[PDB]
Design an enzyme around this catalytic site. Structure first.
Site, PDB file in Angstrom:
ATOM      1  N   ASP A 147      60.520  78.223  16.735  1.00 45.95           N
ATOM      2  CA  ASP A 147      61.261  79.352  16.193  1.00 45.95           C
ATOM      3  C   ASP A 147      61.684  79.003  14.774  1.00 45.95           C
ATOM      4  OD1 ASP A 147      62.253  81.859  16.130  1.00 45.95           O
ATOM      5  OD2 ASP A 147      63.677  81.626  17.775  1.00 45.95           O
ATOM      6  N   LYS A 156      66.615  81.020  25.454  1.00 51.46           N
ATOM      7  CA  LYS A 156      66.797  80.660  24.054  1.00 51.46           C
ATOM      8  C   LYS A 156      67.523  79.329  24.006  1.00 51.46           C
ATOM      9  CE  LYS A 156      65.457  82.798  20.323  1.00 51.46           C
ATOM     10  NZ  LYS A 156      64.040  83.212  20.178  1.00 51.46           N
TER      11      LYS A 156
END
Length: 419
Positions: A145, A105
């Site tokens: 995202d 991430k």
């Protein structure tokens, strides 16, 4: 004593998954800390001729299976406890569908709705020059995202290709790129097509024909519009209920999924469609539908509306809309629910199909991507469902048993954990 931490609730879901299997203690303490955390300072030059510095992170959880893959979040509510939580969450998603991927991430503490289009270029490029030493086409592969888009993912590829001096497969360093730069087809409906296959395969598990059943979808975004669109045009669902953040309607004859979108662009929402019954968002849940698929927001079906749902298949498009308190309520009703990282695994699987094309250099067509996504999601359901039918455990907890053991077998063969 009121503490709801994101990373702490990411570890407690692993220790819940340690009871239902036999795993060594020395490997259980390995999976509770990410193996490399890079937190950098990202300087841009503003339009006022001044320099600001934003705080940008990067967390690589575990590269035992292969290279790591994770999205990039731009939100002002980011913390290091949030990025480390989704990084541990990403490893279980890219394991259960049998990919050679590990978790990851990244995030920047910024508010993107107060930056110009020239400032978003200087922010996206300056992120790459800081963490170039920990990414690459075989090390870490970013992805779009929340509050990112394929426009911004094109810029991060260009700033990486300038640093690399073009000595390597630079189109594979980031996925979800635009069409004419080396992206993949079939990305725009990846979460919708990937979720529609598991509902089709779960019809066989109960032995149910879907030619003429009912389906309802909450929300009407791009992941919401294409889900109800594919239901009529492929399966035969009489789509009888749709909604958005504003309101919901109903039809006892069906709804053409593209007819509603023409009204919603002319109007502000789905409210007051002609020949419809304007109802609330709450009553869409308790309707008499054969299969329900929410996509709006998290925590929508709660402990008071737990036993009102009358359905056969509850497909989780959004990330975990069923609480663990409501997890065991539906099982004693006889309701087959699919897990949160199994029904929307169509986002990462097509994003793996983009990474395969970029390394080889040979681009596929739309006829080829739909076939290999069909063989992946059908296989990833029958491996999970056969586990639940054997140990007589819940489908949510059974999904971790396949996801952990696929990683722990990779940690054992690389020699990282002897016992």
């Amino acid at each position: 004593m009121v503490e709801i931490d994101p990373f702490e609730m990411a570890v407690k879901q692993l220790e819940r998954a340690a009871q239902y299997m036999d795993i060594s203690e020395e490997a259980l303490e390995w999976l509770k800390k990410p193996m490399r955390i890079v937190e950098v300072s990202v300087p841009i030059e503003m339009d006022d001729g001044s320099v600001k510095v934003f705080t940008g992170f990067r967390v690589q959880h575990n590269w035992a299976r292969g290279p790591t893959k994770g999205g990039i979040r731009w939100h002002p509510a980011e913390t290091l406890s949030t990025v480390k939580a989704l990084a541990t969450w990403m490893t279980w998603k890219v394991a259960v569908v049998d990919l050679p991927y590990g978790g990851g991430k990244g995030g920047i503490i910024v508010n993107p709705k107060e930056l110009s289009e020239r400032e978003q270029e200087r922010l996206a490029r300056a992120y790459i020059r800081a963490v170039y030493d920990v990414i690459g086409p075989w090390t870490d592969i970013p992805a779009p995202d929340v509050y990112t888009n394929p426009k911004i993912m094109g810029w991060m590829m260009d700033e990486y290709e300038t640093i690399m001096r073009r000595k390597g497969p630079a189109f594979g360093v980031i996925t979800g790129k635009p069409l004419s730069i080396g992206g993949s087809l079939g990305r725009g409906t990846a979460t919708a097509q990937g979720a529609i296959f598991t509902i089709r395969e779960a019809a066989k598990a109960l032995g149910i024909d879907l030619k003429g059943k009912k389906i309802a979808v909450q929300g009407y975004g791009n992941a919401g519009y294409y889900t109800a669109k594919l239901a009529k045009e492929q399966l035969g669902m009489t789509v009888v209920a749709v909604s958005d953040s504003r309101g919901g309607i109903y039809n006892p004859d069906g709804l053409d999924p593209d007819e509603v979108l023409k009204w919603k662009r002319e109007h502000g929402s789905v409210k007051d469609f002609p020949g419809a019954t304007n109802i609330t968002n709450e009553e869409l849940l308790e309707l008499e539908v054969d299969v329900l698929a929410p996509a709006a927001i998290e925590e929508v079906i709660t402990e008071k509306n737990a036993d009102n749902i009358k359905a056969k298949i509850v497909a989780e498009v959004a990330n975990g809309p069923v609480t663990p308190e409501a997890d065991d309520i539906l099982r004693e009703k006889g309701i087959l629910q699919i897990p949160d990282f199994l029904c929307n695994a169509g986002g990462v699987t097509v994003s793996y199909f983009e990474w395969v094309q970029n390394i080889n250099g040979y681009y596929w067509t739309e006829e080829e991507v739909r076939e290999k996504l069909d063989k992946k999601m059908t296989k990833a359901f029958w491996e999970v469902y056969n586990t639940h039918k054997d140990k007589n455990i819940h489908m949510r907890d059974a999904a971790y048993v396949v996801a952990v053991s696929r990683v722990y077998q990779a940690m054992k063969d690389r020699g990282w954990v002897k016992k």
